[PDB]
From a paper:
[name] (LigIV) plays a major role in ligation of double-strand break (DSB) repair through nonhomologous end joining (NHEJ). DNA ligases I (LigI), III (LigIII), and LigIV share a common architecture of the catalytic region including the DNA-binding domain (DBD), the nucleotidyltransferase domain (NTase), and the OB-fold domain (OBD). NTase has the ATP-grasp fold and is a member of the glutathione synthetase ATP-binding domain-like superfamily, comprising two subdomains that have the RAGNYA fold and the phosphatidylinositol phosphate kinase (PIPK) C-terminal-like fold.
The relative arrangement of motifs I, III, and IIIa resembles that of the other human DNA ligases, suggesting that LigIV carries out DNA ligation in a conventional manner. With the exception of a few organisms in which histidines and phenylalanines are located in the equivalent position (data not shown), Y298 is conserved among LigIVs suggesting that this residue may play a role in DNA binding. R278, Q280, and H282, mutations of which cause [name] syndrome, are located on β1 in the same way as the equivalent residues of LigI and LigIII. This tyrosine residue forms a part of the hydrophobic core of the NTase-3 domain and a hydrogen bond with H316, suggesting that the mouse Y288C substitution impairs the stability of NTase-3.
Residue numbers in the entry: 268 to 308, 311 to 345, 359 to 406
Write the structure that this text describes.
C-alpha cells in the first residue's frame, strides 16, 4: 500500500551549466553563497548525479533538511537536501509549454537522486 506526506521547505531554484551553478530564492536572491557555485563547494554533493548530455538545466524545487539516522525530514543539527518537483529549461530547451505531467516525467531524465540529499517529489 501507500502513504503520502505533505511537506514544505525553502523554495529555491537551481541553474546548471557544466559544473557552474547558481541559487535563486522565491523572490530571487543569490543563495549561491549558502549551497555552492561549483562541486568543490551546502551542496557540492549533488553535483554528480546527472545524466550525460545534460549540461545546462533549470530546476524548480523546495529545500529540505533531513535527519540521517532517522532517515526523515525534520519539519517540526543535520544535513541539507533539495526536493526537486519541476524543470523549466534544460540542454538549451526551455519547455514551459509541456504540461507538468511532462516536466515531472522528464525530471527522471535529468539526474537520478541521492536520498537524503536531493530527492524528487510532486507539487500536486
Amino acid at each position: 500500500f501507500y502513504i503520502e506526506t505533505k511537506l514544505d521547505g525553502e523554495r529555491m531554484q537551481m541553474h546548471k551549466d557544466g559544473d557552474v551553478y547558481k541559487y535563486f530564492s522565491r523572490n530571487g536572491y543569490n543563495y549561491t553563497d549558502q549551497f555552492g557555485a561549483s562541486p568543490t563547494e551546502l551542496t557540492p554533493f549533488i553535483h554528480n548525479a546527472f545524466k550525460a548530455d545534460i549540461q545546462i538545466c533549470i530546476l524548480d524545487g523546495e529545500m529540505m533538511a533531513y535527519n540521517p539516522n532517522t532517515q526523515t525530514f525534520m519539519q517540526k543539527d543535520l544535513q541539507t537536501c533539495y526536493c526537486v518537483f519541476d524543470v523549466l529549461m534544460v540542454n538549451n530547451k526551455k519547455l514551459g509549454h509541456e504540461t507538468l505531467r511532462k516536466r515531472y516525467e522528464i525530471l527522471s531524465s535529468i539526474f537520478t537522486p541521492i536520498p537524503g540529499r536531493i530527492e524528487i517529489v510532486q507539487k500536486t
